[PDB]
Write a protein that binds this DNA or RNA. Structure first.
Ligand code: K
Ligand code: MG
Ligand code: MG
Ligand code: MG
Ligand code: MG
Length: 52
RNA sequence: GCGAGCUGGGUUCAGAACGUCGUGAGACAGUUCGGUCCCUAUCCGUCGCGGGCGCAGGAAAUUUGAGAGGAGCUGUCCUUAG
């Protein structure tokens, strides 16, 4: 029975860690996008259209 | 420079879709098809046209020009001369 409890406990911990890593990957991706968005906010379109 | 002068193709309303992201409503680090352009000009300004008076009498013509505007471009060939 102790073996099974350890196995169940180990499995459940891994599931949680996968969730955490998933969300951190999301955050990293969204950050990168946000920085690029702000960086490109001023550099799009032709000269005249930038001045709009 | 110029939308009370015109257009409205791009983009940034509401629809819909692709890629991608999000558990999601939705979103762009990307695209795509469709999407109401209102106003009778008072004043100055600008382009034309009149009326009034003035210009030491009242008229009909012809004029000077202070001043203002307009115009202001350029090719090729022949000759000089192979
Ligand atoms: K998804
Ligand atoms: Mg963008
Ligand atoms: Mg105007
Ligand atoms: Mg349009
Ligand atoms: Mg005024």
């Amino acid at each position: 029975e102790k073996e099974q409890r350890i196995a169940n406990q180990r499995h459940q911990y891994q599931v949680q860690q996968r969730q955490i890593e998933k969300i951190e990957t999301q955050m990293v991706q969204l950050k990168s996008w946000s920085e690029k968005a702000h960086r490109d906010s001023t550099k799009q379109g032709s000269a005249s259209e930038r001045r709009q």
